[PDB]
Write an enzyme that holds these catalytic residues in place. Structure first.
Site, PDB file in Angstrom:
ATOM      1  N   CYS A 161       0.626  -1.318  -0.020  1.00 46.82           N
ATOM      2  CA  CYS A 161      -0.104  -0.084   0.057  1.00 46.82           C
ATOM      3  C   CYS A 161       0.772   1.299   0.107  1.00 46.82           C
ATOM      4  CB  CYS A 161      -1.070   0.092   0.962  1.00 46.82           C
ATOM      5  SG  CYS A 161      -2.475  -1.464   0.889  1.00 46.82           S
ATOM      6  N   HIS A 217      -0.160   2.238   7.700  1.00 47.33           N
ATOM      7  CA  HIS A 217      -1.002   2.568   6.232  1.00 47.33           C
ATOM      8  C   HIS A 217      -0.733   3.955   5.779  1.00 47.33           C
ATOM      9  CE1 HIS A 217      -3.512   1.048   3.326  1.00 47.33           C
ATOM     10  NE2 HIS A 217      -4.402   1.737   3.900  1.00 47.33           N
ATOM     11  N   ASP A 239      -8.763   5.862  -0.925  1.00 41.76           N
ATOM     12  CA  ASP A 239      -7.687   4.688  -0.532  1.00 41.76           C
ATOM     13  C   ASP A 239      -7.694   3.865  -1.940  1.00 41.76           C
ATOM     14  OD1 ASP A 239      -6.269   2.520   0.276  1.00 41.76           O
ATOM     15  OD2 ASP A 239      -6.961   2.695   2.292  1.00 41.76           O
TER      16      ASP A 239
END
Ligand code: CL
Ligand code: ZN
Lengths: 61, 295
Positions: B143, B170, B187
């Site tokens: 990510c 994250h 996201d």
């Protein structure tokens, strides 16, 4: 304070207090935005306008 | 500044400036099918606007939803372990990392994973590239790579956009909606928009600090991503709130010195909206919302 005392030391409200102190003219816009996003908070502010205004105008470092 | 958090503010401020290179922006657009993304967005706005039930507008907002979708389905791939380069088979992580030869240093990889093939008795290298330009070639990662490359792309299309760093490992993006006059959670790794409680209420993450970084602003956006503000406060043990806010205030004042009066004024009017959101924690709905798993 009254019900709104728990705002006092929240870091985001410390930020809000700083901004309103440096920019008095944003008060009408702040109250109008509160009305939109959090009407129950506005309702509480209307019952105790002085306390809220006192809190906004207390300096913080 | 000897807390890690204050060190990462500085690194992320620098990093975000990278999205402002107009040649990098060009090259990013070299990759995006921008017309088709915009042609599909026009069509959904056309039909949304037939039933006036659809109010305000959403338009560059529709475009944003096309970007998220494509990035996820056409552009970028997830890496767990890379295939073996000799036999094509599965590999497994070595706990002991590899060392960035030299070309891996050139493209911002500080970490290189050893994805080992037992059958071939062969190390396969997985560099963790930090230069978004490199990611437009490789088109893969976890990510970190997804958010890094997605934020470049948003800026390339003329969206105002923040790179968003979560202290709990994250990262994601936020994008401004002039139509709705507010910032929207995005996201790319997850194909989600405007669902800020995903991490706390969907994944049960125990959040502390989430800081957004843009060309214009550093913003502590923590409070957008939580409805358990007291609980988040209990984990904010890494730095004094005073010092964090003075550091961010300092950085904003410093960095905004070279914007216009009108622009600074706009930024102030907008910040009222965010700060009111930050004192307006929302109510979770695990029984209703697909992405909500916690009360
Ligand atoms: Cl949500
Ligand atoms: Zn092999």
């Amino acid at each position: 304070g009254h019900p709104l005392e728990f705002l006092r030391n929240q870091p985001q409200f410390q930020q809000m207090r700083q901004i309103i102190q440096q920019n008095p003219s944003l008060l009408p816009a702040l109250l109008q935005q509160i009305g939109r996003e959090n009407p129950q908070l506005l309702q509480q502010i209307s019952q105790h306008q002085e306390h809220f205004i006192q809190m906004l105008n207390e300096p913080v470092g | 500044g000897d807390s890690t958090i204050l060190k990462v503010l500085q690194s992320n401020i620098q990093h975000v400036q990278l999205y402002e290179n107009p040649v990098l922006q060009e090259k990013a657009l070299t990759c995006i099918p921008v017309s088709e993304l915009k042609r599909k967005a026009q069509e959904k706005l056309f039909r949304a606007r037939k039933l006036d039930k659809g109010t305000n507008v959403s338009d560059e907002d529709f475009l944003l939803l096309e970007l998220l979708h494509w990035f996820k389905e056409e552009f970028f791939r997830w890496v767990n372990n890379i295939v073996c380069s000799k036999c094509g088979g599965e590999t497994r992580s070595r706990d002991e990392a590899l060392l960035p030869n030299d070309d891996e240093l050139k493209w911002g990889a500080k970490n290189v994973e050893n994805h080992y093939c037992d059958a071939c008795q062969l190390s396969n290298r997985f560099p963790r590239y930090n230069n978004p330009e490199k990611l437009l070639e490789t088109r893969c990662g976890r990510c970190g790579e997804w958010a890094n490359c997605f934020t470049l792309c948003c800026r390339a299309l003329g969206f105002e956009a923040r790179y968003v760093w979560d202290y709990t490992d994250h990262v994601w993006t936020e994008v401004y909606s002039p139509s709705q006059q507010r910032w929207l959670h995005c996201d790319a790794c997850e194909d989600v928009c405007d669902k800020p409680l995903l991490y706390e209420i969907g994944w049960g993450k125990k959040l502390s600090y989430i800081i957004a970084f843009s060309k214009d602003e550093v913003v502590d956006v923590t409070w957008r991503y939580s409805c358990k503000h007291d609980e988040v406060m209990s984990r904010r043990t890494k730095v004094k709130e005073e010092l964090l806010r003075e550091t961010i205030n300092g950085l904003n004042k410093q960095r905004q010195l070279s914007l216009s009066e009108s622009r600074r004024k706009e930024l102030l009017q907008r910040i009222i909206v965010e700060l009111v959101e930050f004192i307006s924690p929302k109510t979770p709905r695990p029984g209703l919302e697909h992405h909500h798993h916690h009360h």
